[PDB]
Design a protein around this ligand. Structure first.
Ligand SMILES: *CC(=O)N[C@@H]1O[C@H](CO)[C@@H](O[C@@H]2O[C@H](CO[C@H]3OC[C@@H](O)[C@H](O)[C@H]3O)[C@@H](O[C@@H]3O[C@H](CO[C@H]4OC[C@@H](O)[C@H](O)[C@H]4O)[C@@H](O[C@@H]4O[C@H](CO[C@H]5OC[C@@H](O)[C@H](O)[C@H]5O)[C@@H](O)[C@H](O)[C@H]4O)[C@H](O)[C@H]3O)[C@H](O)[C@H]2O)[C@H](O)[C@H]1O
Ligand SMILES: CC(=O)N[C@@H]1O[C@H](CO)[C@@H](O[C@@H]2O[C@H](CO[C@H]3OC[C@@H](O)[C@H](O)[C@H]3O)[C@@H](O[C@@H]3O[C@H](CO[C@H]4OC[C@@H](O)[C@H](O)[C@H]4O)[C@@H](O[C@@H]4O[C@H](CO[C@H]5OC[C@@H](O)[C@H](O)[C@H]5O)[C@@H](O)[C@H](O)[C@H]4O)[C@H](O)[C@H]3O)[C@H](O)[C@H]2O)[C@H](O)[C@H]1O
Ligand SMILES: [Ca+2]
Length: 347
């Protein structure tokens, strides 16, 4: 056996520059029973290829987050379609083959979209906890043989039944989320093998980081040590892409405060910025057709995010924009100057 156990902090330190393969295996809404490719391409992304993962590794990235949405691939008894599990496995292998770290999660099974069923709510938790544990048991077993470069992330963006994006409206919501987190760690660990010591990722409420969300977050208990990572997301300052001209002191101060708050909260365990980007109101975001000034804005955000995370022994994963759509097939960067700013900041 070639597995080599690695601490959570070591993993996060080795992630380097990360990228989210977004709107891909997380895409959903076309209905059940469709060909696997129908899902993968439903939101405008090409079918993933080995070349894409190789391209990431060979151009200064060492980690990829692979969001997966599962509900359209589960039958009435919660069993995952074999064709779907094999495709998730195949894309994981692309990443493993390229020498990348990879994260597999449970994505639009949470939050505000139709089909979401995992929610920070007492009644929802009660009704879904068995399905959630069975889902993760299947994922853990399916991906059991991959080594320490593969991490599991329990859930993406858990909200209450009100879809409240800052905090649950009722405190009991936190207890539901914390229970899901524990069940996730428990189900994964119970499958044994590499999963006994695999590094696992748990997300805050809404992947947010306001003072109450951080205070009410509690890390699941884990029998092995230093194998848990906490994740938040950061599209900060909120809506800056539509309101700011330049990445100025206000922007920089916003990020530096965020990392200070995160490092103060999480002292013995590493945390990551699992998603970041320009995405703001109405999910408006940068593209190669954006004005040069707006592209520079994106570059400056990314450079700061990357540097600050390095300073704070964290790590970051870009949400989509830098490597998107038809550019994935070439393969080439969508936003070469943004990537260049990230590379310079990290190195
Ligand atoms: C807290 C945090 O950090 N969250 C993270 O935020 C990221 C940035 O927002 C987010 O990524 C975005 O995810 C959304 C999906 O969001 C939905 O599901 C989760 C809910 O909580 C949320 O409220 C919902 O909005 C991505 O949106 C999808 O974009 C698809 C592609 O759009 C792109 O290309 C087409 C162009 O028109 C768009 O302008 C361009 O953005 C789009 O695909 C189209 O789908 C329809 C079918 O739509 C039906 O089924 C899907 C349902 O979502 C939809 O409501 C329903 O009508 C097809 O017919 C078209 O051919 C497709 O093009 C999706 O509909 C749309 O939802 C967004 O792009 C992405 O940045 C992280 O996931 C999150 O963790
Ligand atoms: C003394 C004084 O006057 N103080 C001022 O008080 C103001 C009122 O509280 C305050 O303005 C609020 O600021 C907060 C955040 O402020 C700081 O911290 C985060 C930085 O990003 C920001 O630049 C800083 O200034 C704002 O919070 C944002 O709210 C968003 C939604 O709010 C809007 O819509 C709802 C409505 O009730 C509000 O009035 C309206 O403003 C929220 O949106 C959701 O974001 C997620 C994605 O979230 C990810 O990326 C953003 C990260 O911040 C987050 O941690 C991460 O998970 C999307 O998927 C959802 O679709 C969005 O709805 C933002 O997350 C949240 O940050 C608040 O809006 C604003 O009123 C002054 O700052 C303060 O000086
Ligand atoms: Ca620390």
């Amino acid at each position: 056996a070639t597995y080599m156990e690695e601490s959570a902090q070591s993993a996060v330190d080795n992630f380097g520059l990360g990228f989210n393969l977004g709107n891909t295996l997380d895409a959903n809404g076309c209905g059940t029973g469709k060909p696997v490719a129908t899902y993968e391409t439903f939101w405008g992304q090409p079918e993933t290829t080995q070349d894409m993962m190789t391209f990431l590794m060979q151009n200064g990235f060492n980690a990829v987050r692979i969001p997966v949405t599962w509900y359209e691939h589960m039958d009435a008894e919660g069993n995952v379609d074999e064709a779907w599990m094999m495709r998730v496995k195949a894309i994981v292998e692309y990443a493993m083959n390229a020498g990348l770290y990879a994260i597999v999660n449970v994505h639009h099974d949470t939050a505000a979209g139709s089909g979401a069923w995992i929610k920070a709510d007492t009644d929802v938790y009660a009704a879904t906890k068995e399905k959630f544990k069975k889902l993760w048991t299947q994922i853990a077993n399916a991906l059991a043989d991959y080594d320490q470069h593969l991490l599991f992330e329990g859930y993406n963006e858990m909200l209450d039944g009100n879809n409240s994006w800052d905090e649950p409206q009722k405190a009991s919501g936190y207890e539901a989320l914390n229970n899901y987190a524990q069940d996730f760690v428990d189900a994964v660990r119970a499958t044994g093998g590499n999963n006994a010591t695999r590094n696992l990722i748990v997300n805050t409420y809404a992947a947010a980081k306001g003072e109450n969300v951080l205070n009410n977050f509690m890390l699941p208990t884990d029998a092995v040590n230093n194998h848990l990572i906490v994740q938040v997301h950061s599209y900060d300052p909120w809506n800056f892409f539509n309101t700011k001209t330049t990445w100025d002191s206000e922007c920089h101060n916003t990020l530096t405060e965020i990392f200070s708050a995160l490092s103060k909260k999480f002292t013995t365990i590493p945390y990551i910025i699992g998603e970041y980007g320009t995405h703001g109101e109405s999910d408006i975001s940068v593209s190669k057709s954006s004005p040069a000034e707006k592209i520079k804005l994106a570059a400056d955000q990314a450079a700061d995010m990357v540097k600050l995370a390095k300073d704070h022994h964290s790590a970051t994963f870009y949400w989509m924009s830098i490597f998107d759509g038809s550019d994935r097939i070439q393969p080439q960067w969508s936003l070469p100057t943004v990537v260049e700013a990230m590379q310079e900041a990290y190195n």
